[PDB]
Each structure stands twice: as structure tokens, then as C-alpha cells.
Amino acid sequence: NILDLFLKASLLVKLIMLILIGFSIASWAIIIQRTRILNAAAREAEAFEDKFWSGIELSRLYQESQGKRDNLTGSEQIFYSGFKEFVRLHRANSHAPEAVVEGASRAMRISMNRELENLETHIPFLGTVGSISPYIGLFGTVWGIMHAFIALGAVKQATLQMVAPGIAEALIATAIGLFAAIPAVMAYNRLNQRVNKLELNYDNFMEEFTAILHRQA
Amino acid sequence: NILDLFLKASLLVKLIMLILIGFSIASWAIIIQRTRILNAAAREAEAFEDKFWSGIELSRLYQESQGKRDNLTGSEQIFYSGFKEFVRLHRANSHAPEAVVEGASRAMRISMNRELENLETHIPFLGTVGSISPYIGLFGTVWGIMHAFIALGAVKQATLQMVAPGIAEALIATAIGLFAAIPAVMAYNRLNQRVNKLELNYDNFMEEFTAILHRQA
């Protein structure tokens, strides 16, 4: 049945099909993995932003952040970095507070870039898979048809009726290639659009905190 | 007819069909709401702009505006904001004409941006639906072709009659995809054109009002 037709096909076609199936498994694994991390980051950032506007004293927030200084992620880390830079540079006899504000902004930008780079990993593999997948299947189909016609022209006793299954096996390659290609192409754009929103949220929080810090000096 | 084809389909095909039908219903509802909202907005704007140049003094216009200032929208809201800001800046802080002009311009810009943001919504969903719909149909067709080959290989017959049932569901997926795709694109384009026309009308009104105000001072 299925196994007979699989064995009747040449080795290259089977190898290509197995490669495509493995590609699909890996792509789905990455897609499933990244979504939980992104959602957790979004909810944690929203919760921390909500807690920050309740009117709690900033010293208490700094103490709470310092309690888990090695376990701060997302919007928490940016606040801690900015506050540390602001306080440490303030004891350095800085005559001009504008210098302190600039230093705080610089430290916050550094930490923000590090956190975004941390979040944005493992994505371009999906784009590479989506861009490469169809060509392998097309190559498999072309090779299959080429060898089918070569075998037909080698022996005059052959007929298209006997060679018929080879062409179907060749077309299965293109089918599987498109099957593996499409979801990665969709998910790449979806995840990039989702990351842009977190970038915007971080930027606006950065601006707000910088203004609040500058107004108190 | 359609019920038999839906019942004979596989599980993934049924899920895809359900998703596409839901998309179609949501798109139709969004179109139905937005058409009425946009038409009402355009009619109100045209009527108010017709009323303005009739020879009515700005003082009595402001007096009438405060009666329904809670529900003032569009051009009426822009006029209210501009006149209020102009009056406030004339009797408070510096009285330089440049400052008054700048403040009035900023207030009008803020109000216009808020109104334009209010009018256009749920349109990016239509754009996303139009962009994504065909790919899901192609995915369904590919799955159906794979299923048809597997079923054909299960049996020992190679007649095209056995292959023929393996094409109906694959074509139905694409048909549903196109049916969901077309109206979304059409409505997207029409609504964008209408919003652009409204934006141009608002901009012309605000420039004319700014020119009128700047002349007296």
C-alpha cells in the first residue's frame, strides 16, 4: 500500500521527504515554544506598569527590586538600572544635573537593548525555512520526472502506464514542500509584529521614567 | 449538497472551513457598522461646514456650542477647542500673538488627531483577513491532495474514478478562501478612500480657521 509506493520511489525522493518532515517538526516546536515566553513577558510588563502607578514610595520599589536583583526581567530591570545609575552618579559631585539625566538615559538604553536582544532570539530560522522549503521539493520533482523519462527512453518495452506511480511520488514532494513552507512564513510576520508592540511599550515607559526623574532634579 | 461535502471532509478540513466562515461573518459585521458610522460622520461634517459661512458671529456660535458641548464631535469639536484655547491664551500667561497662534494650532491638531483615530478602527483586521485567507485555503488543498494519494495507495485500483473524490474538498477549501477574501479587500479600499477624504476636509477647515484667527491679531 503506502509502504509499497514509498519503497518504489527512488532514494532521493524519500530522503527529501524525510528532511521536509523534520523541518516541519522543528518549526512547530519553535513556534510553540516562543509564544509562552512572549505572553509571559507581556503580562509581567503590564502588571509591573500597573503596580508602579499606585503611589507607592519609590524607595520601597527600589528595595523590592534589590531583593531579587539577580532575578529582574522586563520592565523591572530597566527601572533598577536607571535608578542605580541615577543614584551612583549623584554622589560623584556632579555639578550639572543634565549630565546625571543623560547618564541615566544612556544606562536605560543599554539595558533595554540587551533585554530586547534576549527576547528576539531563534526567530530567523523560520524565515530561512520558509524561503528554502519549496525549492527542495521542486528539485525532487524535477529529478523524478527526469529519471522517469530516462528509464522510459532506455528500454522500448516501457510505457507511461508502468511509469505512472513515479510521477505521483514526484508530485508528493512539492505538496509536502508547500505544507512545510506556509506556517513558518505566517508565523514570522506574526511574531515580528508582536515584538514591535513590546518595543513601543518599553519606549514609552522609558520616556515617562526619564521625565519623572528629570522633574525631580 | 454542501452538507454532504462538509460531512465527508476530514477533521482539519472542517476546522479550516469553520475558521473561514467565522472570518466571513466578522468581516461582514464590521463592514455593516463602519459604513453607517462613516456616512453619518460625513453628513454631519458637510452640514456643519455649510452652516458656518452663513454669517453667524463666532460669539453666538460658541454660545450655542456649549449647550451640547458634551457630545460635540468632528468640526464642531474642533471649533470649540480652537475658540476655547484662543480665549484662554489671550487672558493668561504671555499675550504674544505668536504664542496664541502656536497654542491654538497645537490644540486643533490634538483634537483632529483624536477624532481621526476615533473614526478609523477594525480596518486592520480586514486587511489581515484579506492577506491571510488564500494561504489557509492552499494549505487545505495540499492536505486534501495528500489524503487522496494515501487513500489511493491504500486500495489496489489506479483508475481516475477512485482519484476523483479526492479533489472535491481540496477545491472547496480554495472556493471558501476566495469567497472570504474578496469583500474584505473591496471594503478595505473603499473605507480608506472615505477616511482620506474626511481627513482632507478637516485639514482644509483647520487651515482656514487658523488663517482667519491669525488675521485679526
Partner: peptide, 29 residues
């Protein structure tokens, strides 16, 4: 990071295996 990736790989592999098995079994009927 590595543990989450390995768990995702395992769950994706088993999901693909069961999906292909279900497709093959259904096509028999």
C-alpha cells in the same frame, strides 16, 4: 532555554507522529 526547547521538540515530534498516524488510519476507511 535549552530545556524549554527540548520539551518543545519532544511535544512537537509526538504531535506530528500522532497526526500522521491518525491521517493514515483515517485514509484506510
Amino acid at each position: 532555554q535549552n530545556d524549554k526547547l527540548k520539551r518543545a521538540i519532544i511535544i512537537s515530534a509526538v504531535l506530528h507522529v500522532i497526526l500522521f498516524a491518525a491521517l493514515i488510519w483515517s485514509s484506510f476507511d
